[PDB]
Design a protein around this ligand. Structure first.
Ligand SMILES: [Mg+2]
Ligand SMILES: [Zn+2]
Ligand SMILES: [Zn+2]
Ligand SMILES: [Zn+2]
Lengths: 559, 65, 114, 43, 159, 196, 168, 141, 49, 263, 85, 133
DNA sequence: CGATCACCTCGAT
RNA sequence: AGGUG
């Protein structure tokens, strides 16, 4: 296990990872010291002799240099010591252990490696500072973030080994994933948030900025697009200047809800040739969606072209937003004076519905349905009554939140936040559960010694009436801590078990591969499948398509 | 541990304001806010500098050698 | 450790020259000047002044990465007008404005009392 | 330091769970994430 | 339960129907009850489906189950992947588990199996039974430090 | 990190001029992303800031003790009394252009902690070095100039990729690799290596 | 109706409409014979297995059964003319583009399909939060889910925690 | 004088505790919408009262500002982190010979304090600084 | 500011971590699962202080 | 005169409030930037520690020494050491300071910037004199000494800009505001009920006319007239911060104009 | 023995991804080791870029031995194999 | 080329659907009893009150990189106060005689219905909208 | 007969 | 062991 299936290896580096909006998708930001440590054996050929000879002259301490010169007969010339370190007249057939240079393929990784996407070939970019740098969109497949994560780097030593990385493992090739038959990378965070903001009908940019934004796109044709406005001022919409990042021959259609080709709400999506006609660009368009711009571009224009697309969108949006700005305050949790009253009375009428159902249970007027306890039914009801309260209270908040609300803004973009977040932070936290039931009587017939015995009231059994804004009471606080702990408990117990599952699965299927007769066989050459996946199609080249002969009326089928 | 020279955020020299601040609090008996403003620390970045400083040196000097 | 020397922000290296003029491929009468060891202080200031010249079709600058001081300035002018002349006039216009500013501040300063 | 000197260890039904009875005796928050979560307590 | 059944006019309709949900399993006996649809009867016990309806039915229920875990989580995995796992457990005739009792006891190479669990004892019985290791497996070539018959090494290159 | 479960590494360092700035000329020592707030629901972080802003201005210690009747309203009432927009927002100008940002920034003081785990104490690179006696494999740990473990989990991704030779290189050229002599008859490592 | 299938026909059509600058106001230069017989030919050319024998011939017929259902429904005589308003040139290009994209869509011999499946299931399994369920609010909806259930399945659990029988 | 008493979980079983001295036992008969919602006196047969519910927490958690306005796991996470945070660990640091000692140059007493911090000696030996911080989308670094 | 509570063993400061054990001499009743013949069990972890 | 116009509101030895009318925002900002980062000053850039029986670490002190403001009046008649032909430092490129302190008294002995002594040949130029604005006459507390405590060191003060290290800024915060009415609509106010009620008015509102209710948005309008307040650390006087600011900016633009002639 | 004749060949006429990566790899390895180039260089120096051009211009003299699951094989030259992808 | 369409419209309703710069206009021609118009206007640059009488014009005249107007001698095809450039995206026929045309001005949408549109409004990346008074 | 991957650090015999 | 993700 520790010496044959896996082992410690040379030509391997590791450090803290950081985010780089000015790095390309397929690139990797390698610290100079690391580049200076790790080397590649390069054989002296008339093609490289001039460069190699010079690199040997740069030596081990100046970056575009080398350490060790391998001649015939075997012997290594240590460039850091050696009296002839400055001498060296190279011969063809000799190897030069040159430092890792810009554009070399390197195998980049992040543990746990539960994916083929957890290990990808990146283009080197030797940079200053101690962190490994990566494009935000390559975050997701590695399941990385920059809270102190560390990543592993491996260096190919053969020409065929570096071909294997560039031709099979490269980041642009991994874009559309076979696992979920959709892409595994998309526009995230500031770029996802900013793109929505930039893309609104309201968003209008002037020449000064337009030109800067246009220049920011490297592939730019150099043609200033005619502004959508030539009235008492020339104005370009956000959609316009962003359609510059999107290449030609790209077509995309959606239709969300109220979408009507006249898209009154600016929903859906319509891109023709490579110009966005209507629709606000959010997660559905620019995320790692099944029918997204990315899935479309990779298929239509190619891997290496789609990889460029990330950088281009990033460069515009990042810049526009750097200048527009975006923040999140305490004010983004504050709901209207009248809204709070409604939220408060919403919870008050839930409290009564619970009280009455309790009053009913105590009078023996409650009759439980076949299959469940008189008490089981009661609890199931109360739990539902109380969940409805939190959901209604949160909905009252969400409705009051303005389109200028920074939290609402993030939720709308799909960058960060969901309903629950709005709800718990501004309206009501809600019921806390352990072992899938509301707070238990740890003490004899009571949850806490601040309560009387046999108290089935919401407050007593763990219902958090308050929002994080209002603040939790000692009981609520403790109760929420009990629920909170349960999360961390399984979070821990999950990984120890899910890890074992992963191994067993892998071990059991190791040897299953598609043979030269479209047959799926094991190490014994025993048939598992006759046609891979029953169609003999690769999972990444597939996508959800509407079969029009199945649905509809008989009358409409005829038409 | 000793009054920082200059405010980290903006740079205004604060390293000459400490003893002055202490006399304003002890001898003049004023409150921190009026003490800070009297020294001429208008911005809150310059305020936290002196107000939030713990002068550990006085404790350290108590160590015998 | 891997942190570069702070003088590399304002001091030119070996082989490194201040301006690097490069003819643009995408458009006619367009040039790309690479300003070495210079940030937004000069970029934005020159780019905004080039926009004042009626014969300047395009003017945009960028700091391709914040680790390095260099910036790229793209200038496109009308036929007959060399963009190197557009940069020249822009630079002078700036000096003349700054000159005026210096004197104007000095005249006002010598009026004040404290 | 203070925190270290006020630590609890539980070797070996649901011991990891913040029990009701812990109120005012053991900290509801202060516990390690994973491995020994809820087995290592602080007063 | 809600059902998608076609209307007499052609369109698929939302027609609700009564469905009984049980605590316990006796498939063999319940399916012979008069008044039910014995064509439609189901159980989360894929092993019971296997014993009553056959290996092919067991395989259909085994996927339906695997699928349902992923689905309930909100996640989506392409058919072909679970299909494969399900077939692997199925091809044996019965239900071979994804453990040392299941797949690791198979007719596979001595070195490829010892890499999973029961390490030494697998190699011990390999010695006594005088096992010949195929060396067609990934694991054996990984151990033997050779280019395995995986993608790139799944064919020979000649001049 | 802040005292609210908010760990994060330095992404980049900007000098005073490139930083966004207040009309007063105040500049952040730190810039944290808005996206760290909605999912984490660490509201107290936002409250600590409001209070700390008021505290620095008035020259008082902010009472951030738990079960108290200190409200966001009460704090907001005091911050406005100091001539600032009540919810911590401040109009800010772009450091590069001097142009006002279309968005106003939640700006104020927050107690941040300098934790251990520093890049320089973590960085490691090895391109051939010390080998363990028994295994003849790269040593373990940064402190010993060790080899990064290319586990079976890593081996699996390479099998999945179908990169047969890279996988062979990782296990042979880099790491292990040894030349033994085999008898054609018994097939054992019994052949006496009498080279030259 | 919506099922993951190779060759996005909708996009192919959209690409033909943009490339050849299709005019919805001008009558097409196509024939019923060109459409009907054209699609019938394209079908015969959607290769997966190249064996000229009966067993492999039917295996091939079987593998393209569903995709051909899509192909036919999409490239119907009424639809080609009434909906798409295609021309002979644009139509002929659509046909050749599907054939090419189909052969690209086919899995590559040597594909380490087994490991791929294991990792494809394993990764979202680690992502699984709540060993409980979203059905926790309701009483008669309590069945073993998440990682414990996935554990029951893979271990071939003789005695499962929630054995149920759904009767119709 | 028996004004205070020592109680373990065993005896806790038999007693009725008020959370506050005031809000939990005065009298009965408009409000602040900003303030959180508290239930009532209701069960009024008290034998004891809580000295202060801030006391349910220990050292690391007693350092957090307003944990009552935070999601339960963030409070647990912070508790783990505060122990990895640098500062003046001890005044005698210069006279000790420890295997690793990380000391902050200019430690700062936080502008946002807990009453529990007075006893924890936090403002006398702090472990962080009051940074002027902007929550914002800037260069996206 | 030092609080004590620790030891100094061969120069190193040692903290004895408080060990959580179930209390002795306590009577406790427990139901036993279906395959077991005994339905309920009464236990006492008797020990001398 | 002609182009940009200045109107000083208030002036002191440490601050300058003024209005920069008839200027472009690009110029207003580039000036603001160059004021912060590119005006050369004099600061300790080398500490030779002879003796240190103090509570503080050598580097801890060395660092604070760098932060001490020093007279940078005649800084232009001093060379950058890198440009100087000497081996290391000299009188044409540096200023040498001495700090000798010892706790002779039982009571705590304090070390101030007044305690630094110039040893270098000054050659009659206003340089290296530690800036003292303190009422008692001893600016900046460098250190505190007990009794046996002694601190013997030597400082080499050198020419440099904030762009290399923040100690070199004649710096301090520079106030910067344009359009106090948002007539330009350059920022979209975040509100709850009323932007006007929730956002406090800037003192610069008095120097401009309100939007005038129901008035059509002036689209073509551009940013001119900037309200600024330059604060000086002390090293260089206020006038000179702005005067040198304009100068550095001219000089750096002129270098480009010159670089064109060389190619 | 064993082999399969050129006529009667069921294997894909199209070259696999694994096939080209191994091909470009092997050819790049040869170019790096001073082997003769079968294509005119266009100021090219990289052994993989040259191998890529030699494939693009179909002048790689290598043959793929496609092993079948029974043990039998089919020999397909780089020249005949379709490099669509 | 020259004008493709020209008409005087009577505004009925004006709506800012959670927008501050943009407004969707509703108008019918003063002449034709069936000719309608639905269009997104920048009311910040040019406001439109309800019941207003506007003159609308679709042209294709006054293609390469954009050059700033430059008053020097450059005279564009307008005695108008509001001009937009856009693209045709759908030519939906609303049965029998009624036909509608879809135009997007960088996302500012426009739908115009009638019958006499004919050989004038065709599938062009070119389209100029002009509004006066 | 099992029982997450990788990574750091310490002081033990 | 003590921790990092
Ligand atoms: Mg992380
Ligand atoms: Zn300050
Ligand atoms: Zn032998
Ligand atoms: Zn000199």
């Amino acid at each position: 296990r520790g010496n044959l299936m896996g082992k410690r290896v040379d030509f391997s580096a590791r450090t803290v990872i950081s985010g780089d909006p000015n790095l390309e998708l397929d690139q990797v930001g390698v610290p100079k010291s690391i580049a200076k440590t790790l080397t590649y054996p390069e054989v002296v050929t008339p093609y490289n002799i001039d460069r190699l000879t010079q690199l040997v002259r740069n030596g081990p301490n100046e970056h575009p240099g080398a350490k060790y010169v391998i001649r015939d007969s075997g012997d290594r010339i240590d460039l850091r010591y050696s009296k002839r370190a400055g001498d060296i007249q190279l011969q063809y057939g000799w190897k030069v252990e040159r430092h890792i240079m810009d554009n070399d393929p390197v195998l980049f990784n992040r543990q746990p490696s539960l994916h083929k996407m957890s290990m990808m070939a990146h283009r080197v970019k030797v940079i200053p500072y101690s962190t490994f740098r990566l494009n935000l969109s390559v975050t997701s497949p590695y399941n990385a973030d920059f809270d102190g994560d560390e990543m592993n780097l491996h260096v190919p030593q053969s020409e065929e080994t570096r071909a294997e990385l560039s031709q099979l493992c490269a980041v642009p090739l991994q874009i559309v994933s076979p696992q979920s038959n959709k892409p595994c990378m998309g526009i995230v965070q500031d770029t996802l948030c900013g793109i929505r903001k930039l893309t609104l009908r309201d968003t209008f940019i002037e020449l000064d900025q337009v030109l800067n934004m246009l220049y920011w796109v490297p592939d730019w044709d150099g043609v200033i697009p005619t502004p959508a406005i030539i009235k008492p001022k020339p104005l370009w919409s956000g959609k316009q200047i962003l359609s510059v990042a999107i290449p030609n021959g790209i077509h995309l259609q959606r239709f969300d809800e109220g979408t009507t080709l006249l898209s009154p709400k600016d929903n859906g999506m319509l891109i023709i040739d490579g110009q966005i006609i209507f629709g606000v660009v959010e997660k559905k368009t620019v995320g790692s969606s099944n029918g997204g711009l990315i899935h479309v571009v990779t298929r239509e224009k190619g891997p290496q072209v789609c990889a460029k697309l990330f950088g281009n969108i990033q460069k515009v949006v990042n810049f526009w937003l750097l200048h527009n700005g975006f923040s999140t305050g305490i004010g983004d949790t504050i709901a209207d004076g009248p809204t709070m009253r409604e939220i408060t009375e919403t919870i008050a009428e839930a409290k009564k519905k619970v009280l009455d159902v309790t009053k009913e249970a105590q009078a023996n007027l409650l009759t439980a349905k076949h299959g469940m306890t008189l008490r089981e039914s009661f609890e199931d009801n109360v739990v539902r009554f109380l969940n409805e309260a939190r959901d209604k209270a949160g909905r009252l908040a969400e409705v009051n939140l303005k389109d200028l609300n920074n939290v609402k803004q993030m939720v709308m973009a799909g960058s960060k936040g969901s309903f629950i977040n709005i709800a718990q932070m501004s309206a009501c936290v809600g019921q806390q559960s352990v072992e899938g039931k509301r707070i238990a009587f740890g003490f004899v017939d009571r949850t806490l010694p601040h309560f009387s015995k046999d108290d089935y009231s919401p407050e007593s059994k763990g219902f958090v009436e308050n929002s994080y804004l209002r603040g939790l009471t000692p009981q609520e606080f403790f109760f929420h801590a009990m629920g909170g702990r349960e999360g961390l408990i399984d979070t821990a117990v999950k990984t120890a078990e899910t890890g074992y599952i992963q191994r067993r699965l892998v071990k059991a299927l190791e040897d299953i591969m598609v043979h030269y007769d479209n047959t799926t066989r094991n190490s014994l050459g025993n048939v598992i499948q006759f046609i891979y996946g029953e169609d003999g199609m690769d999972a990444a080249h597939i996508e959800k398509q509407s079969l029009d002969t199945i649905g509809g009326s008989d009358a409409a089928f005829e038409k | 541990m000793i009054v920082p020279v200059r405010c980290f955020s903006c740079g205004k020299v604060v390293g000459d304001k400490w003893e002055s601040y202490l006399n304003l609090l002890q001898e003049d008996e004023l409150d921190e806010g009026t003490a800070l403003s009297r020294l001429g620390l208008k911005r809150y970045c310059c305020r936290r500098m002196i107000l939030t400083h713990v002068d550990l040196i006085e404790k350290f000097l108590r160590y015998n050698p | 450790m891997n942190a570069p020397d702070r003088f590399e922000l304002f001091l030119l290296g070996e082989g490194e020259s201040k301006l690097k003029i490069d003819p643009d491929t995408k458009a006619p009468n367009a040039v790309v000047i690479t300003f070495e060891k210079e940030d937004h202080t000069l970029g934005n200031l020159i780019r905004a002044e080039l926009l004042n010249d009626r014969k300047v079709l395009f003017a945009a600058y960028k700091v391709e990465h914040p680790f390095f001081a260099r910036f790229k300035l793209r200038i496109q002018t009308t036929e007959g007008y060399d963009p190197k002349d557009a940069l020249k006039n822009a630079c002078n216009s700036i000096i003349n404005k700054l000159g005026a500013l210096k004197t104007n501040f000095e005249t006002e300063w010598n009026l004040q009392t404290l | 330091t203070l925190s270290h000197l006020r630590r609890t260890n539980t070797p070996i039904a649901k011991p990891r769970q913040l029990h009701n009875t812990h109120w005012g005796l053991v900290c509801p928050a202060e516990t390690p994430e994973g491995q020994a979560c809820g087995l290592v307590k602080n007063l | 339960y809600d059902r998608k059944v076609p209307s007499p006019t052609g369109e698929y309709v939302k027609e609700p129907e009564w469905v009984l949900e049980t605590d316990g399993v006796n498939l063999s006996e319940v399916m012979t009850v008069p008044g039910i649809d014995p064509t439609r009867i189901y159980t989360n016990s894929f092993i019971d489906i296997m014993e009553v309806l056959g290996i092919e039915a067991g395989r259909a229920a085994l996927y339906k189950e695997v699928y349902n875990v992923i689905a309930s989580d909100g996640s989506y995995v392409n058919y072909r992947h679970m299909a494969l796992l399900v077939d692997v457990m199925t091809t044996q005739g019965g239900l071979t588990s994804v453990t040392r009792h299941g797949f690791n006891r198979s007719n596979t190479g001595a070195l490829m199996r010892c890499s999973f669990e029961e390490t030494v004892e697998i190699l011990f019985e390999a010695g006594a039974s005088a096992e010949l290791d195929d060396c067609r497996g990934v694991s054996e070539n990984v151990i033997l430090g050779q280019m395995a018959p995986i993608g790139t090494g799944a064919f020979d290159v000649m001049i | 990190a802040s005292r609210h479960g908010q760990k994060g590494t330095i992404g980049i360092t900007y000098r005073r001029e490139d930083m966004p700035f207040t009309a007063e000329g105040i500049v952040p020592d730190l810039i944290i992303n808005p996206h760290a707030i909605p999912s984490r629901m660490t509201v107290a972080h936002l409250i600590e800031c409001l209070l700390s802003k008021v505290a620095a201005l008035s020259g008082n210690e902010g009472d951030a003790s738990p079960f108290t009747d200190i409200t966001v309203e009460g704090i907001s009432k005091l911050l406005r009394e100091h001539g600032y927009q009540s919810r911590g927002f401040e109009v800010m100008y772009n450091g590069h252009t001097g142009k006002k940002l279309m968005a106003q920034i939640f700006f104020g003081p927050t107690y941040y902690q300098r934790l251990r785990h520093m890049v320089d104490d973590k960085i490691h690179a090895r391109a051939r070095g010390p080998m363990q006696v028994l295994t003849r494999q790269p040593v373990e740990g940064r402190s010993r100039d060790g080899g990064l473990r290319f586990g079976e989990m890593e081996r699996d991704c390479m099998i999945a990729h179908g990169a047969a030779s890279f996988l062979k290189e990782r296990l042979m050229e880099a790491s292990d690799a040894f030349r033994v002599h085999i008898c054609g008859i018994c097939g054992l490592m019994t052949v006496i290596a009498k080279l030259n | 109706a919506n099922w993951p299938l190779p060759v996005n026909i909708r996009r192919i059509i959209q690409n033909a409409q943009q490339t050849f600058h299709i005019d919805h106001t001008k009558p097409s230069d196509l024939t019923i014979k060109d459409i009907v017989l054209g699609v019938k030919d394209l079908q015969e050319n959607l290769l997966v297995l190249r064996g000229k024998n009966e067993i492999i011939q039917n295996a091939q017929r079987d593998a393209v059964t569903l995709f051909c259902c899509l192909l036919r429904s999409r490239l119907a005589t009424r639809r080609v003319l009434q909906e798409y308003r295609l021309t002979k040139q644009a139509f002929d290009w659509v046909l050749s583009n599907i054939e090419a994209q189909f052969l690209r869509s086919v899995v590559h011999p040597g594909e380490m399909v087994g490991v791929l499946a294991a990792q494809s299931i394993g990764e979202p399994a680690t992502q699984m939060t709540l060993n409980t369920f979203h059905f926790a609010g309701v009483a008669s909806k309590k069945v073993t889910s998440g990682v414990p259930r996935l554990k029951e399945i893979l271990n071939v659990a003789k005695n499962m925690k929630t054995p149920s029988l759904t009767v119709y | 004088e028996g004004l205070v008493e020592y109680i373990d979980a065993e005896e806790e079983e038999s007693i009725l505790i008020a959370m506050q001295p005031e809000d939990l036992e005065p009298a009965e008969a408009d409000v602040d919408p900003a303030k959180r919602i508290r239930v009532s006196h209701h069960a009024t047969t008290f034998t004891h009262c809580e000295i202060h519910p801030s006391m349910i927490l220990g050292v690391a958690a007693s350092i957090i500002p307003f944990p009552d306005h935070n999601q339960s796991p963030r409070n647990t996470y912070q508790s783990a982190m505060g122990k990895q945070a640098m500062g003046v660990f001890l005044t005698n640091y210069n006279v000790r010979m420890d295997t690793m000692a990380n000391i902050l140059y200019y430690p700062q007493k936080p502008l946002g304090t807990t009453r529990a911090m007075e006893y924890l000696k936090f403002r006398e030996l702090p472990a962080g600084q009051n940074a002027i911080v902007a929550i914002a989308c800037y260069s996206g670094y | 500011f030092d609080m004590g509570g620790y030891f100094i063993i061969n120069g190193s400061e040692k903290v004895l971590i408080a060990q959580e054990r179930s209390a002795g001499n306590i009577v406790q009743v427990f139901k036993k699962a279906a395959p077991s013949p005994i339905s309920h069990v009464a236990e006492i972890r008797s020990a001398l202080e | 005169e002609e182009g940009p116009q200045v109107k000083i509101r208030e002036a002191s030895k440490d601050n300058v409030d003024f209005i920069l009318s008839n200027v472009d925002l690009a110029m207003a900002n580039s000036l603001r930037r160059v004021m912060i980062a590119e005006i050369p000053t004099l600061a300790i850039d080398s500490v030779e520690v002879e003796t240190n029986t103090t509570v503080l670490a050598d580097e801890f002190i060395a660092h604070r020494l760098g932060l001490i403001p020093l007279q940078s009046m005649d800084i232009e008649q001093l060379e950058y050491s890198r440009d100087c032909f000497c081996e290391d430092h000299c009188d044409k490129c540096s200023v040498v300071l001495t700090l000798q302190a010892f706790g002779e008294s039982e009571s705590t002995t304090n070390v101030y910037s007044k305690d630094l002594v110039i040893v270098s040949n000054l050659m009659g130029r206003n340089i290296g004199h530690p800036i003292i604005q303190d009422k008692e006459g001893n600016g900046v507390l460098i250190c505190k000494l007990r009794k046996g405590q002694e601190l013997k060191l030597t400082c080499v003060a050198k020419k440099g800009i904030a762009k290399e290290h923040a100690k070199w800024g004649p710096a301090a915060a520079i106030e910067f505001e344009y359009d106090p009415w948002n007539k330009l609509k350059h920022t979209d106010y975040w509100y709850e009920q009323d932007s006007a009620k929730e956002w406090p008015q800037s003192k610069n509102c008095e120097y401009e006319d309100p939007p005038n209710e129901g008035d059509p948005f002036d689209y073509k309008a551009q940013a001119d007239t900037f309200y600024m307040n330059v604060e000086s650390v002390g090293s260089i006087p206020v006038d000179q911060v702005v005067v040198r600011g304009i100068d550095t900016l001219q000089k750096k633009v002129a270098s480009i104009l010159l670089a064109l002639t060389q190619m | 023995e064993k082999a399969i004749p050129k006529d009667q060949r069921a294997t894909t006429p199209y070259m696999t991804k694994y096939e080209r990566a191994r091909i470009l790899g092997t050819r790049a390895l040869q170019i790096s080791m001073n082997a003769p180039v079968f294509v005119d260089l266009e100021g090219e120096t990289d052994p993989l870029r040259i191998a890529m051009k030699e494939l693009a211009e179909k002048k790689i003299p290598l043959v793929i031995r496609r092993y079948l699951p029974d043990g039998s094989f089919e020999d397909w030259s780089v020249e005949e194999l379709i490099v669509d992808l | 080329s020259n004008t493709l369409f020209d008409d005087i419209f009577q505004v009925s309703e004006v709506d800012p659907g959670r927008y501050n710069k943009v407004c969707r206009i509703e108008a019918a021609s003063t002449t034709q009893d069936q000719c309608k118009l639905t269009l997104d206007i920048n009311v910040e640059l040019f406001p439109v009150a309800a019941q207003d009488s506007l003159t609308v014009t679709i042209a294709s005249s006054l293609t390469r990189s954009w050059r700033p107007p430059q008053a020097g001698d450059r005279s564009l095809a307008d005695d108008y106060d509001y001009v937009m450039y856009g693209t045709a995206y759908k030519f939906e026929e609303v049965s029998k005689d009624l036909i509608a045309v879809y135009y997007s001005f960088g996302g500012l949408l426009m739908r115009l219905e009638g019958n006499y549109r004919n050989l004038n409004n065709l599938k062009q990346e070119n389209a100029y909208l002009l509004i006066r008074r």
